[PDB]
Amino acid sequence: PKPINVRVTTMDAELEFAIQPNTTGKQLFDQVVKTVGLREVWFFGLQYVDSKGYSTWLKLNKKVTQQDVKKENPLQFKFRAKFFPEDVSEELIQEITQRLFFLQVKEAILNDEIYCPPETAVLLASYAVQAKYGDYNKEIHKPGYLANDRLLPQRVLEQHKLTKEQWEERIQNWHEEHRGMLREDSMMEYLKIAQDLEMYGVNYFEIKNKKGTELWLGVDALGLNIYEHDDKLTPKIGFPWSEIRNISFNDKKFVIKPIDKKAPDFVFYAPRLRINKRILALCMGNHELYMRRRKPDTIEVQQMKAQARVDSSGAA
């Protein structure tokens, strides 16, 4: 059989190679995972674009080429965080996990995919500079050191009237105060502030209700939420896992059956059947981890948290 060109990219890597034409998604995954030395695999997946212009997640069970993968050379893939923990502090154990979450989240905030207010964005920026350059040194980090760096969301630079050097001074002032903070600590402090942002870790889906009004369905670690089309920060209606008895779809109709037997089922419409299938898969994947983290840590996890306790110690 003729080999297929695949190119899985990490937030800070690029992995080009070939596999068997009749190879599963888990084989590609298990390969990417080992090449990179990632063990907390449960937060990740391989994202790809299809024939309709959608960015979904590779199914591990099926063959790579069978699930609608945009045909090209090489076959573009992206190793990314698919699930976000409820608390980054106690759930992202290893350094490689933390680094990958940091880069993806930072990339998303910078691209304006996740909203961030101006002051918070600057504070985030300084943690990013502290993480890249390390301790601020007046002698080496001479004025203009942050001129080649993209630090703020494009939309905060536009909504706020400050010159280029002024913004760089705001971030510099914060950088100075982070002295002593290691890279791992700096990225985690970044993620700690980022995880409280309204749009962080939310998977948005363009939907419509019975009437026809355009809405947004958001799927995250805690449940489902319906948003008004021009407001993706504040949910108009929320559905925590604890208030949902059942979730299902019928062609283009998705139904959320509440626990309260006196409340009406929430019904929405997706543009296509594939959307509803992906919506249910994500919900199940998030609820799965929601349950998993509420059950005692696996022997493997207990050991990783024990290994990180050592890699953070400064004693001989």
Binding site: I244, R245, N246, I247, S248, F249, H287, R294
Partner: peptide, 16 residues
């Protein structure tokens, strides 16, 4: 031949 799907959120709690 079914273009449907369902998941029992409440029922999944095998915690018991």
């Amino acid at each position: 031949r079914r273009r449907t799907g369902t998941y029992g959120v409440l029922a999944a709690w095998r915690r018991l």
